[PDB]
Amino acid sequence: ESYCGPCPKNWICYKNNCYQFFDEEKNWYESQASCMSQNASLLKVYSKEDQDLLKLVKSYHWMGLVHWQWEDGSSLSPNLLTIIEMQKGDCALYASSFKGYIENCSTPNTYICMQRTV
Amino acid sequence: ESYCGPCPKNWICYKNNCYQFFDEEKNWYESQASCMSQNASLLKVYSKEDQDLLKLVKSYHWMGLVHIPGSWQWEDGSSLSPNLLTIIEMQKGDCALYASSFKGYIENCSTPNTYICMQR
Ligand SMILES: O=C(N[C@H](C(=O)Nc1cnccc1-c1ccc(C(F)(F)F)cc1)c1cccc(C(F)(F)F)c1)c1cnccc1-c1ccc(C(F)(F)F)cc1
């Protein structure tokens, strides 16, 4: 047993990360700004074990991966995501299980915001 | 305060409730026993606000709602709140599957289904 967080009330907490799904479709840049306004960033995938809840995510959602590195400038670690071509573009949609579909950054999509606690 | 729980280590926490999805298909009675083995119960729906994450649940899963011939009641013996679930009959049964958004499908208790456990 343990506690999870800290997270704001409207976020799912899993292994001390906070996740929130946004159903209003936006391009990658507008989604990034939305997460920032919530003291967060777009989903960053850094651990298959500590983020194994992402195996259960359905549909396709902006994550913070750009052409590959994350918003915060950090690199994509190997053996975390299978990146699959789909549409010509420089952004990627998260899909289960641990897949990234390359997508046009200007195409509206739903998105996942995430806050790390440490 | 800003922490959620307590909950078992690898469960999801939301508004101080803990949830775990089980992909193994079991009948209602086996699912109930599985949650109890983990010091939990099958999903109980009490608030569309506190449990609005249930709007995002895909597919159908056992919850702790049973018919006692009476009315629909939860495992713990408490009553189903009105205006919470829309109950839809499509099989002869005394048990119910949760489906989004805030629906309960009457289902044969013996039919294997995936299930959701919950702890508070
Ligand atoms: O992924 C979407 N739904 C699955 C789903 O239920 N998947 C299953 C598939 N097959 C079978 C079962 C599930 C499943 C069933 C019950 C639970 C339970 F234990 F919770 F009870 C969890 C999973 C999902 C995944 C993680 C957490 C939750 C939640 F906790 F909210 F219930 C739900 C989904 C679908 N449409 C739009 C948006 C989403 C979505 C996107 C991001 C996020 C996140 F996490 F990033 F915020 C959450 C939801």
User: SS3 sequence, A41-97?
Assistant: EECCCCCCCCCHHHHHCCCCEEEEEECCEECCCCECCCCCCEEECCCCCCEEEEECC
| A52 in contact with B, Cβ within 8 Å | yes
What residue owns the CA closest to ligand 1's atom 25?
A: A57
Q: Where are the beta strands (DSSP E) in B8-120?
A: 12-14, 17-26, 41-42, 61-67, 72-74, 86-89, 95-99, 103-107, 113-119
Q: Do A2 and B5 touch (CB under 8 A)?
A: yes
Q: Which atom of ligand 1 is nearest to the CA of A20?
A: 47
- Distance between terminal CA atoms of chain A? 20
Distance CA A113, CA B62 (A): 29
d(CA B63, CA A47): 31
Domain range for B5: 1-120
**A9: nearest CA in chain B?**
B15
Q: Nominal resolution in Å?
A: 1.4
CA proximity to A6, closest of B17, B5, B8: B5
**Contact predicate A114/A42, CB 8 Å:** yes
Spatial CA neighbour of A42 closest among A50, A51, A33: A33
Domain count for chain A: 1
Interface test with B, best of A10, A12, A19, A53 (most B CBs within 10 A): A12
- Which residues have C-beta within 8 Å of that of residue B108, sequence separation ≥ 6? B91, B92, B93, B95
- Separation between Cα atoms, residue A83 and residue A89, nearest integer Å: 12
B22 shares contact with chain A (CB less than 8 Å): no
Residues 6+ apart with CB under 8 A from B120: B16, B17, B18
Nearest-angstrom CA–CA distance, B69 and B56:
32
Shortest-distance atom of ligand 1 to CA B11: 19
Interface contact A1-B14, CB threshold 8 A: no
Q: Are B60 and B105 in contact (CB under 8 A)?
A: yes
Which among B15, B6, B18, B107 has a CA at the least distance from the CA of B63?
A: B107
Angstrom distance (rounded) from CA A62 to CA A111: 4
Cβ separation A12–B7 shorter than 8 A? no
Instruction: Using DSSP, state whether B21 is helix, strand or coil.
Output: strand
Number of A/B CB contacts below 8 angstroms equals: 50
